[PDB]
Design a protein around this ligand. Sequence first.
Ligand SMILES: C=C(/N=C/c1c(COP(=O)(O)O)cnc(C)c1O)C(=O)O
Ligand SMILES: C=C(/N=C/c1c(COP(=O)(O)O)cnc(C)c1O)C(=O)O
Ligand SMILES: [K+]
Ligand SMILES: [K+]
Ligand SMILES: [K+]
Ligand SMILES: [K+]
Lengths: 455, 455, 455, 455
Amino acid sequence: NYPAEPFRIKSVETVSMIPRDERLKKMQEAGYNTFLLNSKDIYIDLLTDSGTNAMSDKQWAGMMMGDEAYAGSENFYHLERTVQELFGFKHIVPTHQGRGAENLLSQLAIKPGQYVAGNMYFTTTRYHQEKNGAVFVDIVRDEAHDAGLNIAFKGDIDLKKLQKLIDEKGAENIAYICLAVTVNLAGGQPVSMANMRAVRELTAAHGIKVFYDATRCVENAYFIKEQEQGFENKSIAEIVHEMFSYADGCTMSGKKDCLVNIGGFLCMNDDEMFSSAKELVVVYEGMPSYGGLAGRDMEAMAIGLREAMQYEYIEHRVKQVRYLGDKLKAAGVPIVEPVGGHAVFLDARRFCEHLTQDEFPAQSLAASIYVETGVRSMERGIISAGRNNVTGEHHRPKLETVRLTIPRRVYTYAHMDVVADGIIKLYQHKEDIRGLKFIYEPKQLRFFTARFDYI
Amino acid sequence: NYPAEPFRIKSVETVSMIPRDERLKKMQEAGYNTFLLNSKDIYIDLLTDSGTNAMSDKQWAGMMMGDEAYAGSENFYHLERTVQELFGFKHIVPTHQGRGAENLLSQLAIKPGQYVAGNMYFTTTRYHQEKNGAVFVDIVRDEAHDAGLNIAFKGDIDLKKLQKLIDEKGAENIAYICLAVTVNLAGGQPVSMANMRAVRELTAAHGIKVFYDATRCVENAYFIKEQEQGFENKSIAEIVHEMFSYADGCTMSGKKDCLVNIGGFLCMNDDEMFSSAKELVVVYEGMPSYGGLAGRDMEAMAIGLREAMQYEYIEHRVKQVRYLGDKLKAAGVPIVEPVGGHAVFLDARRFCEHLTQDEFPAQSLAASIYVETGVRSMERGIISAGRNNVTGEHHRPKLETVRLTIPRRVYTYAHMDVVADGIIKLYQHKEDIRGLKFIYEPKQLRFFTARFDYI
Amino acid sequence: NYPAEPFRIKSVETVSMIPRDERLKKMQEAGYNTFLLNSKDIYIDLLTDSGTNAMSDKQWAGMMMGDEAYAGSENFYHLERTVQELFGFKHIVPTHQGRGAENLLSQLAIKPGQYVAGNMYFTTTRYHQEKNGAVFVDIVRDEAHDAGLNIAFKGDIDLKKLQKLIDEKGAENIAYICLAVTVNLAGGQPVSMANMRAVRELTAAHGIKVFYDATRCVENAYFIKEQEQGFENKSIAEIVHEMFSYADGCTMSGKKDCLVNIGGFLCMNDDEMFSSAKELVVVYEGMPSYGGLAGRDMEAMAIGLREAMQYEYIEHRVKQVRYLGDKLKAAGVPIVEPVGGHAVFLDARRFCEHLTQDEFPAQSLAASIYVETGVRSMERGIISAGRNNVTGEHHRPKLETVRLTIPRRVYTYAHMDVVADGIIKLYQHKEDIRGLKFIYEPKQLRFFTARFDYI
Amino acid sequence: NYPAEPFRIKSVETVSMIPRDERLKKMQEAGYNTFLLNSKDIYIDLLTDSGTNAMSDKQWAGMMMGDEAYAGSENFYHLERTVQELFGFKHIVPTHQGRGAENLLSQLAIKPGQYVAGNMYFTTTRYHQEKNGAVFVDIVRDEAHDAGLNIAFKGDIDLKKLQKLIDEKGAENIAYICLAVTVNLAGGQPVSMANMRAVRELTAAHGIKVFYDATRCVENAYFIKEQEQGFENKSIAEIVHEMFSYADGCTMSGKKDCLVNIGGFLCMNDDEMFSSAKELVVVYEGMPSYGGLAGRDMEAMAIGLREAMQYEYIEHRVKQVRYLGDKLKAAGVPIVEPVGGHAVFLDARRFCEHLTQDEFPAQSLAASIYVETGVRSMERGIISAGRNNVTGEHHRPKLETVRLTIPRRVYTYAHMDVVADGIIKLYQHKEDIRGLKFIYEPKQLRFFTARFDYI
Ligand SMILES: C=C(/N=C/c1c(COP(=O)(O)O)cnc(C)c1O)C(=O)O
Ligand SMILES: C=C(/N=C/c1c(COP(=O)(O)O)cnc(C)c1O)C(=O)O
Ligand SMILES: [K+]
Ligand SMILES: [K+]
Ligand SMILES: [K+]
Ligand SMILES: [K+]
């Protein structure tokens, strides 16, 4: 069952419906790298769900009431009250987006040489942990690393790995546990409430802090409501509030589940850390009462976080992604399983099994998808993994995928059909997909500006 | 086929359904007339495509650049030259919506006792004709009155009827021919270019003026491109411009095909009529330089009329209506055929064969649709047709219909499925729909605020 | 004493600061008629205070929450509740602006041959009265016709003239009393509460209806608060509510004192007339619940009417106009006295006493003002009076004036200084102002498109 | 002279004053630091010109056309090419505001132990220099530190000081010269083109890089046009482009002279530095294609930087500040002279000659201004100067000032008169202002959230 949109369209965004012949020329001008395409040339842009969301009429009304004062803006107090109400943390510091909050948390909470342990990781999060002297330890359950395994709550932390870390390194040498909801690297997999409570129980017995990476915590809450026994009578807001009751604080990218185009924040319960955070936020972001955001954006993020709590909104959000995954899977197209809250990942290793990884199957599949449909997707394979600059060899990741990342409230099921129909047609003659070779490769950030040609 | 939306969602508004018990209360508080229900108590609002459209990001950018000057506004010049370019008429007078332009035309072009002949009546149009002393004569082809007959270009004028009128009444006693594109009350049926050309040739030979009702001219142009031999490779804009080349002027409700929420205009080629129209507009609407519109709305209408010329936009507009009609017809639900440009008309005579037309089956069917579905639709039958101003008896249209009217760019195919599924279920117990009788009847245009009770 | 603006600027409107040499070319291209100037070529546009107001951030937030439903829009209920609260009338029908409401009132309230009596008149108001068969009778106090007489509440009705009318024509032959607040034709002069109560007392004794032309009723309320004994402790809202307690209904142009760019409405207390108005509004304007306005505009007008009740806003509005009049008067420039709520009128007969009225001194002064300052003003003299088309002679009005009409919240005191300094400099060599002659004169609406050259 | 605003008001926001008793309570709740007051409790907010500007109708139209794509946004391309055209640098990296660009520059261009030399310190700039291991050296002319000395181009670097630094330290130990235009903490003082050219010539001869702080470069260009011989007939844009031709790159807070509420960027000519900057921006800000900004804000900043080039806009901006300074100086109030581009600085040393600088007269004067006036102003003296990171003692600036900072396009001359009248009255009892002592001092950038009590 797939629900209708629980909203209607207030205003539309103009697009170029250029045809296949012209899309091929645009793809070649981009050197077959979807990251180099111009937005104006893309029909359906599934590069990312970050910051690409459609706002409501209520949020746009809030955008006309930005109090742009440098200190003490009414919009900050609205955001503060909303986050305290819905997440339940004592203190909040706005940041311009998620990695701004990560920067502050890692400087406040890590002594060099300490460990940070988490359920897999995200690139910016782990960078700020490592930059401040932490050693990262993955404590996710082993199943999360099996991309074909169709089981619930795949993002759960293995409590035995956490106990083992505590026993081998000592609780005083662990800076914090970093629990992400959902788990992006596993394909957007949720964490169960039972897991969050067990982690809080164990860490609290040792005086260890837990901070959440909360960027898709509402998608996570929907999975708990749908699949965890005992939560069928709880509202999304009740589930969200209980989730954060098991944490000492969080970092949040509003660009994901708060339904905005920019914005984030840092939450914590400890007064002393809050005071230290306010001393640091002015260094990198702005005042404790704007944190690198215009007043109107704090307002839109306060309104959007509250909208995200509507059951029908988040049900439809997750089930629209599920629709895309279900349609591909029914045609035999290989995807990461189960489908996550925000994206479908194509398995390009299996999709293009006639290509070796050195011929960049995911990069080439993403280029084919755009030519055939006008859909942009993100390479998440060997190109994004980068090259080892000491040895000169590619980093070879186990996952060679194309990410179909779904912005919130932007597309319809008919757009999902454009994406799926086009991929299914490609799959039916997948052996015709050609390998790629570099014609320009920069030393760093190579996925952003590299250019290719066909082998 | 059924194309996906050729645009993305930029902003949303929430929709919601109140329980059946509450809709029942609301419906009897509205005296079983859908016009009297409150917007907040509707779920999917298909009352009308008039003024309910979603604007684009470009139109909303135009809304921030309203030049609100009383005379000489940049927005007026933009609207004036956009209409001169796309429609080809010499002169434009803005009005706040279509019936303001009809008020002006009828006062300018009718001498009491004269005939106005058109391809089927419309409610406000016919009121202003008769109010100024004209007798209305219907010269549409007989087939347009047969709901079930699936033939192309049902809106066409019967040239034999036009010829007969000229012979029996004399050309000097005909004030003008009123040619509407599409024809709303026939079900949104298009008029062919061959018919517009034949009508021009016959009227010109007798010195008789032709004024178009331009309200859904872009939907009409799409049907010409899709189905009239020789037009398959003409652009929508080319077809629109050729259409109006066979007219002396037009009235336009921009609230339909100009993709806005308010706005209209009167066009003409004749200099003396334009001079007279400017004297009159001051009394009813405003100065000729804004015609009862804010500058920002002249701007949005100039932008939206040009957007409407995009083939993919109007193809999707029309085929989304066709999807709803196709799904209802596949389930056996009786509808007006072929499906028109803007709405699906349920054939209330067949839905409610247990009722005579004096029991108002269309009015009653609309009420029952809201009660069982939360979807609002409009009566288009004996209630809307009014009374004969000579005998005092009902006008008795063969077409007794309930209109599922689709606003432009607002809903998705999933919303269409919700509508179709609900109507198909009500079809299964159609015998439960009771007849209605008047408890309050306005003296004109009675359908707007009439109140009914069950017989 | 002149207060600072009780607001700050949220956003600005871009203007062309073209210099004098270029302004002279624009004036010549406009044939020396300020009505023909392009808005884009004007620095400070004082043509009118109608519909040219600046909205607040709160109103623009309301503009993002337009409920564009054809019937039952939430914005209509907001407007309805606001007008019932602030004006106290039982029923309200929205219209697209003031003359839409006048059209409806005059058709509902006049039997042919009846009299309508008022404190002077406005052009559209009297047209709709006369078009429906009324004979207009001026019952303003004699002093209002003395444009140099500096006395308070110059708009007051002479109760003896009203008694005389009742005695000579009979109360059953008077359709209604039309009491305007303020009185535009006298230069924007207020009416006292004592006068409103006396008129209500007298008319009620005879069963005669009173309807207000309420377009600048808030400016009027400020004069009562400032100058009528006993109202120093009353709020603007209290004064406004008491004013309308002496009326049976009103017509309102929101384009003036409701601080919007479009919109108006009709109010009445009588159920039967309300029911008749709802039958008529659909003919000319729209549904009783939108009346020719987009939902967003009903919202902005509801918000703006409530903002207009703020004492500091309306005090500053009236005193900014007063500042301009005081500065001109201190330099000896001849103006209509006292200065009204919305405009300063220059006496061009005295300003250009070396020119005869057939040389159009007001039209020429308005052209000079634009060339010297970039300020557009309105001719209100012999050109606007029109030509008698039977005899071919000008209508020769006693008042030959240039109107400096001040939009609400758009300009600063520094703009008022630009206007005043430029006029004062012109006055110091007023004998150099040249007379004008027609080079193009249309048969009607001649002030709108006539063109001139220097004698 | 004092020109009128070269724009009209398009939209407003209300302002209000709470009673003195309430401001007194608010001020001690803020611990006598103006940074801790709440926006709703301020009347006229002169805390800062940073991010408080009023945008234009064109910018707000741009805000409706935000292309929120993660890469390839039309808004990024517009900002990129606008900056390349107006500033002339080869490469641009957007950041969410200026201190994000300072974070990147300081990490890219400083090796620990090296010197950075600039024309007076700024708070966030100096923090990021020192945090990355640089020693700051002030090479502004001695006169810039003398509040009362009225000389032109007080921001100029002393070339003898620059030469001395090169001789004593060696050019290889200087990371770069930081040249700010205007110089904020000297009172908004401009730098001459002759000085920028001399600095470029001397640094280039030694291979030393020059990076500008571009934050108020348009105000600086205005002073050059107004006062530097030979530039009187150059356009603001020409002057701006020549200015940056003497630099290797710049940091920019668009929140000042780009007329926006959020936004900044880093420019450079060097290709390898640009490559490194793109790696770093990902960690702190976002992808190089949006740099921590929504698309709509890249758009507003591209539009606003071009608007700032309009001569009449920036002339009025600067002369409105000058008006406030002239009115205070005419009444004997001690100020920094000449008045700078963005603010009037009261000379707190002279206002409060009864206090030593260790009693924080500037911090105390700011509090008393809010208590007596409701006007918020900022401390710019010993509190902002921070502590010496080697000795732990106060930095002791000669300039102990209270800043009346003017947001662009927000206030009128009448608002300036309210401010001046209030300060002139407080001047009459200056002996009533008590000294302050710290009760809470942050470890860096302490002025933002420090809390004080009276001695
Ligand atoms: C309101 C509707 N139509 C308006 C209309 C009008 C009157 O336009 P305004 O509603 O803008 O006055 C004129 N001609 C045709 C063919 C129309 O359909 C409707 O069908 O719902
Ligand atoms: C916030 C202020 N200034 C910021 C600033 C900055 C830092 O910019 P952001 O506030 O955008 O980070 C850098 N350079 C100069 C000369 C500045 O004035 C202020 O003066 O109020
Ligand atoms: K974004
Ligand atoms: K701001
Ligand atoms: K207007
Ligand atoms: K509407």
